[PDB]
Design a protein around this ligand. Structure first.
Ligand SMILES: CNc1ccccc1C(=O)O[C@H]1[C@@H](O)[C@H](n2cnc3c(=O)[nH]c(N)nc32)O[C@@H]1COP(=O)(O)OP(=O)(O)NP(=O)(O)O
Ligand SMILES: [Cl-]
Ligand SMILES: [Mg+2]
Length: 264
């Protein structure tokens, strides 16, 4: 059946949503790191959908074994849809992960959760603008007030690897895009086609996990090493910082659009 993965920072309301969606009473708690293993369940309002609760994760270069369970689930290619649960009150921080999720090529739908806390803070987010600039569907949800939950599941079900055509990725500085294209050429079929961009950017960043997982030839490694060196000279910066700063810069732009109330 259709597999929907709940992915997002710890303490963002993933399990709270899962409980509402499935009828389960899985562990929910007011600190990061409550869920520690995968839990499956059927969506109650549509039994053709299976949803997976997973440990929280801050980055796809993860900081804990628990987060690595979420990462490895996604890179195993089992999910048809990512339901990215985003804490609306800490948007910028949460979108760091989001950018990497979009790059996997598994279609992303955002549950913009804890919208009730944002409402209580006297703040708002332009959901249509956020969606437009991020290139993914966005539904405002509250697991507390039980709003938007059935809507975001329906959207996630409709936003699948089988229904979505050409996927729209976050576009960075064209000097980085050039290096990404070069790395993709070198990789060829050495990575799954759907997630190739994710892996190419991780190779540029010289991510240890990804370098260990991919069985790249000496030839490929030498050409990638050369592409990174050339690009660092162009940027006048190290590779790791180039990518971090480009993600940050992208998120900054999108968030100033999400804060924008003025009609356009
Ligand atoms: C009134 N409720 C709260 C308001 C603010 C902060 C905590 C709570 C709190 O008493 O506790 C729970 C929630 O009640 C609350 N919570 C979840 N959704 C919402 C929401 O929409 N709104 C509010 N106010 N709280 C929410 O957020 C907390 C995390 O939920 P979790 O489901 O455990 O999150 P993960 O599964 O992502 N975590 P991990 O990755 O490590 O498994
Ligand atoms: Cl992490
Ligand atoms: Mg949880």
């Amino acid at each position: 059946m259709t597999e929907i993965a709940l992915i997002g920072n710890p303490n963002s309301g993933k399990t709270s949503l899962f409980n509402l969606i499935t009828g389960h009473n899985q562990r929910v708690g007011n600190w990061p790191g409550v869920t520690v293993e995968r839990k499956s369940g059927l969506v109650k309002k549509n039994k053709d959908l299976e949803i997976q609760d997973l440990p929280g994760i801050y980055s796809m270069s993860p900081y804990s074994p628990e987060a690595k369970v979420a990462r490895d689930y996604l890179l195993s290619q089992r999910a048809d849809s990512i339901l990215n649960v985003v804490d609306a009150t800490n948007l910028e921080r949460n979108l760091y992960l989001t950018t990497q999720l979009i790059e996997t090529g598994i279609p992303v739908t955002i549950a913009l959760n804890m919208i009730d806390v944002l409402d209580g803070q006297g703040k708002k987010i332009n959901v249509d603008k956020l969606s437009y600039h991020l290139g993914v569907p966005v539904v405002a949800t509250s697991a507390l007030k039980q709003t938007g939950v059935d809507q975001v599941v329906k959207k996630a079900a409709h936003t699948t690897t089988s229904t979505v055509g050409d996927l729209a990725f976050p576009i960075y500085d064209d000097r980085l895009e050039a290096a990404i294209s070069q790395i993709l050429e070198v990789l060829g079929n050495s990575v799954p086609q759907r997630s190739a961009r994710f892996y190419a950017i991780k190779l540029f960043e010289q991510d240890s996990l990804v370098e260990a997982e991919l069985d790249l030839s000496q030839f490929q490694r030498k050409e990638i090493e050369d592409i990174i060196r050339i690009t660092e000279e162009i940027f006048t910066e190290d590779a790791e910082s180039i990518v971090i700063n480009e993600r940050y810069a992208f998120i900054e732009r999108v968030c100033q659009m999400a804060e924008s109330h003025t009609e356009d």
